[PDB]
């Protein structure tokens, strides 16, 4: 019965793998030249996030990143490999924006640590047997998310507006893309296999695939095609 997996969403997973991989190879066979030590950081950071995502999407495709969790009434398919990805992916995405706005080490740590809680709490939620409690973890995860998005929006903007026109402009486009994409994750989770079965794992997988590739490669293509602070 149970929210069928290991087979339907294979195309989505495979397609995720393809885009992440090509996006990786792209950022690689583009960062060939790049002298500027500042620009060097952005290329490095932004190339690892596709590579992490490639590794993890492969595991889901090949089955390894799938597991079964007892909840609600049945044997529920869960892709923990998402949290393995996101654990390192989402802090690096933050580090790009931190570096771009030259944020204080204080905020950076507060940020990365908070992101740590967001994903960790998410995984605890995803694997929690007791149905009712999954939403306790979702709420906490969403609090960690909205905190991060707050400092990005109401914080990092002001600091950005004081940099260079290019930096303020570039940060803002990214800030927009980030706030929007990130805010989708708790929604698609809550309606998906992982929470209330409004929407099947099949669509849950597809939504996350589109969101993920946008938040890795789409995000990266805004950044690595602009003036990356002093550098290019
Ligand atoms: C490339 C992947 C990205 C940018 C992933 C972002 C992930 C989040 C913003 C996750 C948020 C979550 C919630 C707020 C609730 C349920 C648990 C999470 C981790 C899925």
- Give the 3-state DSSP-derived string for 145-213, with helices as H, strands as E and coil as C: HHHHHHHHHHHHHHHHCCCCHHHHHHHHHHHHHHHHHHHHHHHHHHCCCCCCCCCCHHHHHHHHHHHHH
Q: Is the CB of 79 under 6 A from ligand 1?
A: no
185: CA distance to ligand 1 center in Å?
5
Nearest to 166, CA basis, from 219, 217, 216, 223:
223
Helix (H/G/I), strand (E/B), else coil: 111: helix
Measure the CA–CA gap between 61 and 76, rounded to whole angstroms.
17
Helix (H/G/I), strand (E/B), else coil: 141: helix
Q: Which two tokens stand for residue 200?
A: 């099947």
Please say whether the beta carbons of 31 and 38 come within 8 A: no
Q: Which of 24, 51, 124, 185 to mutate to test the pocket of ligand 1 (most atoms within 8 A of CB)?
A: 185
> 10 Å Cβ neighbour count for 147?
16
Q: Which of 48, 115, 122, 181 to mutate to test the pocket of ligand 1 (most atoms within 8 A of CB)?
A: 122
Domain count for the chain: 1
Tell me the backbone φ, ψ of residue 71, rounded to 5 degrees. Answer: -155, 165
Please say whether the beta carbons of 178 and 93 come within 8 A: yes
Measure the CA–CA gap between 221 and 26, rounded to whole angstroms.
10
**CATH code of the domain covering residue 80:** 1.20.1070.10
Residue 90 domain boundaries: 1-232
Measure the CA–CA gap between 212 and 182, rounded to whole angstroms.
9
Measure the CA–CA gap between 12 and 29, rounded to whole angstroms.
25
Q: Which long-range contacts (CB under 8 A, 24 or more apart) does 206-209 make?
A: 206/9, 206/12, 208/82, 209/12, 209/13, 209/15, 209/16
Helix (H/G/I), strand (E/B), else coil: 66: coil
Technique used by the depositors: NMR
Pairing verdict, β 74-78 and 67-71: antiparallel
* Ligand 1 atom having least distance to the Cα of 141: 14
């Amino acid at each position: 019965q149970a929210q069928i997996t290991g087979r339907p969403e294979w195309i989505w997973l495979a397609l995720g793998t393809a885009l992440m991989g090509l996006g990786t190879l792209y950022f690689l066979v583009k960062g060939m030249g790049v002298s500027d030590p500042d620009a060097k950081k952005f290329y490095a950071i932004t190339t690892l996030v596709p590579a992490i995502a490639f590794t993890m999407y492969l595991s889901m495709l090949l089955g390894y990143g799938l597991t079964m969790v007892p909840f609600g009434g049945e044997q529920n398919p869960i892709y923990w490999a998402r949290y393995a990805d996101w654990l390192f992916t989402t802090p690096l995405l933050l580090l790009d924006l931190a570096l771009l706005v030259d944020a204080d080490q204080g905020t950076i740590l507060a940020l990365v640590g908070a992101d740590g809680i967001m994903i960790g709490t998410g995984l605890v939620g995803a694997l929690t047997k007791v149905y009712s409690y999954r939403f306790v973890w979702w709420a906490i995860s969403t609090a960690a998310m909205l905190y991060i998005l707050y400092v990005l929006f109401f914080g990092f903007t002001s600091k950005a507006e004081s940099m260079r026109p290019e930096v303020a402009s570039t940060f803002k486009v990214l800030r927009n893309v980030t706030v929007v994409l990130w805010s989708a994750y708790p929604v698609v989770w809550l309606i998906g296999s992982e929470g209330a079965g409004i929407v099947p794992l099949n669509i849950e997988t597809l939504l996350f695939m589109v969101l993920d590739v946008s938040a890795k490669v789409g995000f990266g293509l805004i950044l690595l095609r602009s003036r990356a602070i002093f550098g290019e």
